[PDB]
Amino acid sequence: EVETFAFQAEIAQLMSLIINTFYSNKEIFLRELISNSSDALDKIRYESLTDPSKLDSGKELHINLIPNKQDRTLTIVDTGIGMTKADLINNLGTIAKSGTKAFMEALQAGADISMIGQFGVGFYSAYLVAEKVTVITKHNDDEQYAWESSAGGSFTVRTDTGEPMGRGTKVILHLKEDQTEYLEERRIKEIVKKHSQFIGYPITLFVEK
Numbered sequence: 531e532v533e534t535f536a537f538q539a540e541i542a543q544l545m546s547l548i549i550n551t552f553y554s555n556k557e558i559f560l561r562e563l564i565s566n567s568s569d570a571l572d573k574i575r576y577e578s579l580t581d582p583s584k585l586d587s588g589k590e591l592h593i594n595l596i597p598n599k600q601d602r603t604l605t606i607v608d609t610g611i612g613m614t615k616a617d618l619i620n621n622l623g624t625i626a627k628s629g630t631k632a633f634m635e636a637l638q639a640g641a642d643i644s645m646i647g648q649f650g651v652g653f654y655s656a657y658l659v660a661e662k663v664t665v666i667t668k669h670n671d672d673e674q675y676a677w678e679s680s681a682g683g684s685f686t687v688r689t690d691t692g693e694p695m696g697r698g699t700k701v702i703l704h705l706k707e708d709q710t711e712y713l714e715e716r717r718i719k720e721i722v723k724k725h726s727q728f729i730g731y732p733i734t735l736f737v738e739k
């Protein structure tokens with residue numbers, strides 16, 4: 531059972547802009563997702579200070595990067611607070627609408643795509659390198675869901691039947707054919723050392739067979 535939804539018009543405009551603008555400095559997407567994961571870890575960590583049972587679904591707070599050359603996917607896993615079904619359908623886009631509009635006003639003023647993080651909507655930079663994004667998420671107060679979009683105006687939400695995660699979020703980037711450099715260990719390491727040396731959680735690169 532799968533539900534299909536339309537993006538808000540401003541978000542569909544930002545995604546189509548990100549997929550179509552010729553922009554070579556695509557590596558910033560990794561910085562943005564790691565920073566998002568760090569935020570999600572901060573929130574679960576803070577909540578657990580007054581309620582330790584919030585960590586019953588997982589005490590480790592970390593970020594894994596999992597390239598896969600065979601499936602041409604790069605997965606960013608974190609054990610943060612995760613997202614409810616209402617987050618996936620409404621709440622995230624509600625908070626993002628203001629940063630989307632402001633970010634597009636800047637782009638018409640000549641501003642750079644790499645400044646997307648300052649408006650709180652850096653996750654859509656995933657579409658610089660991904661033709662399709664799958665988000666597997668589990669929040670303490672909801673069931674495990676799978677969000678997916680290939681842009682084009684619509685996304686899907688469904689209950690996830692795969693491996694239970696406990697708590698956290700899995701961002702799976704189905705990379706475009708010409709963006710496989712982000713599946714290489716030394717390229718990922720160069721980006722992480724450069725863009726996210728100052729994250730307060732362990733970042734583990736999973737290297738392949």
Ligand SMILES: O=C1CNC(=S)N1CCc1ccccc1
Binds near residue numbers: 623655656677
């Ligand atoms: O826009 C929505 C509505 N519901 C969810 S989730 N998003 C976030 C899309 C996203 C893109 C890239 C990386 C991570 C997430």
